[PDB]
Each structure stands twice: as structure tokens, then as C-alpha cells.
């Protein structure tokens, strides 16, 4: 089985974007879907949608990329330059509100799971609650 489903989804997204895929299918879960909501809201992906593979439900994440570049390596710039899981099984990471990291001095996001739902660093900071530091994305 999967030891960390959330990290599995993040790695699926990483490996997909690294080869400039159209979309990627991740085994569906409410937590994963709530994270994908933040992703699409922040513009790292074109969005997601629930789908069905042969018998089981999945989530199609439609990836996002920049314009085709000039010169050698015309591959476009990545919209998700970096996506890393922080609170892994075996070392869980919880932070207070005064301990939420400012990712890339603003240009990134940090996804938290708080008692008021799955939020971003700025969202949680405005709400005034902390929680589990799921992952950093920029």
C-alpha cells in the first residue's frame, strides 16, 4: 500500500510536470481533494476533476505550464517549480500561528491543515490558527 498518500500525490504531480504531461490521475480522497482546491485556487494547476478508472475513483489534476521558451531547451517554464512534503509519517510537523513560514518571502505558499480546514500560510495567518505543515509549494 501507500505509506503517505498525500506525498504520493505530490510526487505524482512532480513527475508529471517534469515531463510536461497533460493531466495526472491520483487515487481520490477528501483530504487530497481539499489540497487540490488550494492548488487550483492559487493557480499552480488548471484545476482538478473527479473521474473513474476501471472500477475506482480518481482525481485528474490538469497541469499548468508557461509559454514555450526560445533558444535551446524550448521546454516551457514550470508553473510548479518546487513542491515538497513537510509533515511526513514518522516525523509530523505542527506549527503555531507565529511559526508559519513565509515561503519564498511571499512568492510561494505553505499548505496547512488547521482545525478550521485546509488553508494556506496567508489564509491561516489571517485566520489566526496554526496546525500541521502539510507541504511547501513555489
Amino acid at each position: 500500500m501507500l505509506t503517505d498518500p498525500i506525498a504520493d500525490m505530490l510526487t505524482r504531480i512532480r513527475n508529471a510536470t517534469r515531463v510536461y504531461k497533460e493531466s495526472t490521475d491520483v487515487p481520490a480522497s477528501r483530504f487530497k481533494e481539499e489540497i487540490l482546491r488550494i492548488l487550483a485556487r492559487e493557480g499552480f494547476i488548471k484545476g482538478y476533476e473527479r473521474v473513474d478508472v476501471d472500477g475506482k475513483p480518481y482525481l485528474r489534476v490538469y497541469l499548468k505550464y508557461g509559454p514555450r521558451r526560445q533558444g535551446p531547451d524550448p521546454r516551457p517554464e514550470q508553473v510548479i517549480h518546487h513542491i515538497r512534503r513537510i509533515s511526513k509519517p514518522g516525523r509530523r510537523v505542527y506549527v503555531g500561528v507565529k511559526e508559519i513560514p513565509r515561503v519564498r518571502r511571499g512568492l510561494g505558499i505553505a499548505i496547512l491543515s488547521t482545525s478550521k480546514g485546509v488553508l494556506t500560510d496567508r489564509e491561516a495567518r489571517k485566520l489566526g490558527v496554526g496546525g500541521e505543515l502539510i507541504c511547501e509549494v513555489w
Partner: protein, 99 residues
Amino acid sequence: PKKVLTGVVVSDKMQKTVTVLVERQFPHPLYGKVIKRSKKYLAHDPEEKYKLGDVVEIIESRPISKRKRFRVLRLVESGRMDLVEKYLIRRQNYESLSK
């Protein structure tokens, strides 16, 4: 506030005394992992009311004897011998590593 813990009665072999095992989770001071420690407390059972496997609350009390500083407040839930079996297997493993 007198400290009130919650544990499992793992020894009723004494007279008017029970050994209550109490666990506690906390993040590691340097490595942040939520680790789980435990400690056995000798609690006072003046009625022999509590038996093996009983999950009970324990309260800080006036000293009854050397190593006996706690009383059994109430019964949380009745005998669940699974945690007792876990502790007994943990103890039984010690005989296998001598020489």
C-alpha cells in the same frame, strides 16, 4: 490541582495495591517525532475493587507507602486484556537476551 493520570491495571498480585501503567505522547525535544513513553505507578486499592485489564483514573494522593503515592480515582473502562498482554510480552522478551 492534584495530578490525575489514566492507565491500565497490570498487577493485582499485591494486597490493596495495583500497578497502573500510564502512557504519554509528546514531540521529541530535538527530532520533533511524536514519541510515546510510559511509566508504572503503584496505586492504592483499599477495596480490591479493580482487577487486571481495568483502565482506571489515578489521582495524586498523600503517601501511603514507599513507592505508593497514588489512589485509584474511578474506573474508565472494564477489563481489556490486550494492553496487559502487550506489557506481558514486552516483559517476557527480556529473558531471551542474557548471554
